[PDB]
Amino acid sequence: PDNVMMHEKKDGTLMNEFTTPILQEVMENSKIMQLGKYEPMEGTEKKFTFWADKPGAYWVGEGQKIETSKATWVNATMRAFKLGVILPVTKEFLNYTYSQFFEEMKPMIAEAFYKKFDEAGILNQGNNPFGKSIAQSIEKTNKVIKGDFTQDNIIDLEALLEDDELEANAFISKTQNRSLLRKIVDPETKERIYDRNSDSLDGLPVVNLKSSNLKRGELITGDFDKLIYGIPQLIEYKIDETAQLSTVKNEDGTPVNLFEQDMVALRATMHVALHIADDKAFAK
């Protein structure tokens, strides 16, 4: 029913017309997203792993093996805020209408989602955990490398993935770490490893994590399943906040300090097949 026309809708589910644009901007900005492969689900999904030994009308008693089951859930919510405080009251958005608001909000909400998602999803730090994660899988299987940036260490890092019959695909290095990567050249084969123009380390694309949970680190991915469900779903807000902070020390009292916020609850799920490597600085 609604399209352009007006904008006086406080509560409301976003239409799939607008859900694909907002998620399109989230896809490029998020680092884990770019690397992963997203199969569709609802509230939950049950996935099974492994193969089996199978002969043709003979069979000797060997190769029984293990089969593993797994299910996934838990959400990833984030706030818009920015648009709301810049553009106040509904009558002001009545001129903008439904179509105008989403396009103008597009980069702010999309920037928000990935920052929180990666801060808890890759490094297990941000307060929205769900067990399955990159940093958590490394605690199970030790793939640790010492703090030196030479070709042989990156070869040894990839070799640790090869030990458990697995191929390297992509890389994750911090923006600050980009300086040290470029100044690594072998004496015999005089060629630069990390190419500046085509962002890749060993002919494999590096993706720059903007989160401040790294220093001199490299993460590696390949077979990885992120999932998404439903809608972003918006609610207009003229009420008190606990989560946010108003500059000095007091909170975001929306009707106290005359603002007009927005709430956007997106539903995103994660699954990990395990065996992922990581280099970290040792120093002393």
């Binding site: 694909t20 896809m27 199969e39 695909n169 694309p205 993706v207």
Partner: peptide, 16 residues
């Protein structure tokens, strides 16, 4: 949902 997965493969870093 299915359109998002189609867009994902197009807008991936490594298309496969």
């Amino acid at each position: 949902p299915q359109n998002l997965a189609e867009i994902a493969r197009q807008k991936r870093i490594i298309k496969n």
